[PDB]
Paper text:
Most antibody isotypes bind their Fc-receptors weakly and depend on the formation of avid immune complexes for stable interactions, however [name] binds its high-affinity receptor (FcεRI) with a KD of ~100 pM. Therapeutic anti-[name] antibodies (e.g., omalizumab and ligelizumab) were specifically selected to compete with [name]:FcεRI interactions, and not target [name] receptor complexes.
Omalizumab displays weak disruptive activity at high concentrations, while ligelizumab does not display any disruptive activity, despite the ~100-fold higher affinity of ligelizumab for [name]. The omalizumab scFv exhibited higher affinity, secondary to a slower dissociation rate (kd), and a twofold improvement in ID50 for complex disruption as compared to the Fab. The binding pose of omalizumab is well conserved in CDR proximal regions in all structures, but conformational flexibility is present in regions distal to the binding interface.
Residue numbers in the entry:
A (entry chain I), E (entry chain K): 1 to 120
B (entry chain G): 336 to 544
C (entry chain J): 0 to 114
D (entry chain H): 336 to 543
F (entry chain L): -1 to 111
The structure:
């Protein structure tokens, strides 16, 4: 069974930069599916942040384009969210999720427990 | 208009090792331009080269089938194949999905008997097979006369029902002729099931005498 | 500049066995190719969402048949035919039609009394 | 509104020799004025006194059933009974008919055995019966506990389905008490069918 | 299984009389159903002539009432058509048929092969 | 002449195997009563006695091929052969059983072309 675990949260300073990591086990992130980062500000809505397909195609939300970067590591079966110039508007819980494919459209069938990012 | 999406048989999947899934559209009149029916996998991996075929029946309906091959490993690893039919005469689309049935897995145990001769039919005998306690429910039953595969017509098998306990069961009847068992009195009731170990096969041998 | 999803009601109370109906309205159509790319998620507090329905009306595997989805264009509805104790959660709709993918704000389904 | 008219059970026709046929009307709105449910026979002899029953339903639906006794000699001789439902609402009338289904006829073969005793059945044993190659489809399946006929509740049997060649077949599954296989270790599966000979009965015995 | 045989036909002279018989087998003509005579002029339509019930009731076609009689004979399981003063218009094929009963109305479900009557 | 007169059409027709044949009967007066219509349809092949096909306008006599169908009410009734067959070439009669004397139509011959 596919399992996903976020790491890299903590108390962080504004304007700095942080790397979140999603450690996937039980399925290979180059064998299929889309790999997403979705965040949730406290008691607010879910926001889709960025994705990478198994074949390497990347997609971003315009709300974070430029200051956020998504990469993977075939060797470590992990993928990463690089965030620069952190703002208060970035404080949230970041979930990583495995998207399942429906005729060119993706839905988020598997998530992980979440990691918290807080910006003073 | 209706659309049906079949799963690969345990036999096609573990013996022929050439599994395919068919998406069948029925009840359509030639009518306006023909229907478009495309595929998708849950993994997002691309879909093979699929073959389409159109057939006009006696009742005037159109049977459009699309056949897609699958990798046995892909199927067992738990892929999801999805068919989608669109038609101008239909506002929304029909979608059918198929995948490996989730749950526990128990291989089937098999029992075969012959019926006692009946008065008035000395030359036909009936052999019976009960196959039970397996899951999931997908199973393939085939009869052999000493390593000669018999046409699937020669036998009738019940659809799997769920027992009181945890397995499913099926019951198969095969009517064999006197000439067949006098030339060779060995008959094989064989089950192909994904839990059976090894080679996904369980069988019993049954004799008329 | 994105697609907005408004859900209603915001919050509601019910009892076990009731029938609950939630509405999602998209700022613009999410239809293409005879399908509607609206997905429904359940989120219990301190836990991560769980996918229930994708493409408006199709059930994710292992999801109880009591969950059903329907709709087209910009008007979608999640229907729980028979509420159960475990069904008390916040529920989100999210459109997969056009980038960037967007979620509604959520409908909180709380048990009748005081949570 | 739908309407169903049954046949006599072979057992009612060839053993008890007190056959009946039931005409069942369903899907009525109780709002409507009551339905007329009259009878006719092909012979023109008059109709026995038929029994009427109304039973309201959980669907808001209403069920009226009418049972009519029929002559054994009359039925086998090739008689036709016809039920007619009319209503002041309904435009015309519904009619359902019944007869001895003419065709080729073959008597049933019977076999009984035990299913392998299995974990979770310390006091429970399971008995099965195969009945095949009969036609027409009309058949009555009976389990008897050594010269005592068993309650039909104790056994559940499958609907007749068509064989590859030409006969019909059914399955009867039966679980017998520890006391029952100890009080008597013999059980009888019997079928009643118009081709069966003699007395339209064939049966076998099987034990735990 | 309810088979019916006409007899007694033949060539007959005008103004005379003849009697046809329907020899019924496989059912008792007093046990049930209606027992009819139907005749057909060469290349003309069918004309219903006479009926008798299991209980003895008679019915005639007014076009021949008064010169046609229908009678029965329980022991020979036979019934008869009595015709006096034959005319040319009586020339036809005479069929006997067993009518079945539907809520007070009869239809002709079983027939016999016919016997020919020729006048002049 | 106060009897019920049944007029059929067509009198004669030509068809091919597989066609749909439709025959019509028109009665001098209504043969409806008690929610039913007492019109019966018979088939007569040459030199053989008639055979009953449909009774009460629309009910198929037992053992009658499913392609035969009847319909109608009032004074208008129709026999329909949905898919003509090689043996179905014959003359076809309607007969009313509502009011005595029972009367027959004049027959329609369906001929093979
Ligand atoms: C006009 O005439 C045509 C021609 O006869 C009619 O076409 C038929 O139409 C019916 C009605 O829809 C249709 O019935 C459905 O059949 C589905 C297909 O299943 C059949 O075929 C498959 C493949 O051939 C079989 O499974 C295969 O098994 C093989 C090994 O075992 C394997 O190699 C293969 O890959 C498949 O696994 C299957 O056993 C069966 O033979 C059925 O799935 C379906 O029933 C399902 O759905 C209902 C609910 O909707 C359930 O209640 C049911 O239990 C089951 O789950 C339908 O019954 C039939 O296939 C079709 N045939 C053709 C050739 O077109 C047409 O219907 C007529 N229509 C009119 C208006 O006149
Ligand atoms: C209202 O409440 C009622 C609850 O009692 C419901 O009534 C039930 O209605 C169904 C009809 O859908 C009856 O079901 C059966 O009908 C089948 C038909 O299948 C075959 O039957 C003949 C048998 O030879 C076969 O020739 C046909 O071709 C069919 O394939 C039959 O097997 C039986 O006759 C049986 O009647 C139920 O019996 C009936 N229940 C009772 C208790 O009477 C009803 O559905 C509710 N809803 C409505 C809208 O009325
Ligand atoms: C049904 O028909 C018979 C025949 O006259 C009659 O007894 C009955 O009153 C009629 N209608 C009803 C509603 O019973
Ligand atoms: O009751 C047993 C069942 O057998 C027969 C069917 O037509 C049903 O209407 C009936 O109820």
């Amino acid at each position: 069974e596919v399992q996903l675990v976020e790491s890299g949260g903590g108390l962080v300073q504004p304007g700095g930069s942080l790397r979140l990591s999603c450690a996937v086990s039980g399925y290979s992130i180059t064998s299929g599916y889309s790999w997403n980062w979705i965040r949730q500000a406290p008691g607010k809505g879910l926001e889709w942040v960025a994705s990478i397909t198994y074949d390497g195609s990347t997609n971003y939300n315009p709300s974070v384009k430029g200051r956020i970067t998504i990469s993977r590591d075939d060797s470590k079966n992990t993928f990463y969210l690089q965030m620069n110039s952190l703002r208060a508007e970035d404080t949230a819980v970041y979930y990583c999720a495995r998207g399942s494919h429906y005729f060119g459209h993706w839905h988020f069938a598997v998530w992980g427990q979440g990691t918290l990012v807080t910006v003073s | 208009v209706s659309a049906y999406l079949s799963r690969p048989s345990p036999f096609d999947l573990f013996i022929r090792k050439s599994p395919t899934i068919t998406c069948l559209v029925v009840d359509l009149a030639p009518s306006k331009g023909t229907v478009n029916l495309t595929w998708s996998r849950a993994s997002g991996k691309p879909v093979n080269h699929s073959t389409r075929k159109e057939e006009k029946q006696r009742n005037g309906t159109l049977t459009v089938t699309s056949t897609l091959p699958v990798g046995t490993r892909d199927w067992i690893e738990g892929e999801t194949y999805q068919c989608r039919v669109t038609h101008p005469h239909l506002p929304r689309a029909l979608m059918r999905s198929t995948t490996k049935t989730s749950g526990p897995r128990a291989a089937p145990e098999v029992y075969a008997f012959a019926t006692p001769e009946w008065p008035g039919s000395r030359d036909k005998r009936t052999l019976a097979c009960l196959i039970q306690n397996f899951m999931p429910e997908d199973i393939s039953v085939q009869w052999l006369h000493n390593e000669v595969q018999l046409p699937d017509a020669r036998h009738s098998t019940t659809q799997p029902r769920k027992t009181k306990g945890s397995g499913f069961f099926v019951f198969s009847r095969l009517e064999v002729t006197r000439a067949e068992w006098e030339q060779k009195d060995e008959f094989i009731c064989r089950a192909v099931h994904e839990a059976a170990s090894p080679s996904q096969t369980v069988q019993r041998a049954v004799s008329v005498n | 500049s994105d697609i907005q999803l408004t859900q209603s009601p915001s919050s509601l109370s019910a009892s076990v066995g009731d029938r609950v109906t939630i509405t999602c309205r998209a700022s613009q159509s999410v239809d293409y190719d005879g399908d509607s790319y609206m997905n429904w998620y359940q989120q219990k507090p301190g836990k991560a969402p769980k996918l229930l329905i994708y493409a408006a009306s199709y059930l994710e595997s292992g999801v109880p048949s009591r969950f059903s989805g329907s709709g087209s264009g910009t008007d979608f509805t999640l229907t729980i035919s028979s509420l159960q104790p475990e069904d008390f959660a916040t529920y989100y709709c999210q459109q997969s039609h056009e980038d960037p993918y967007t979620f509604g704000q959520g409908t909180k389904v709380e048990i009748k009394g005081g949570s």
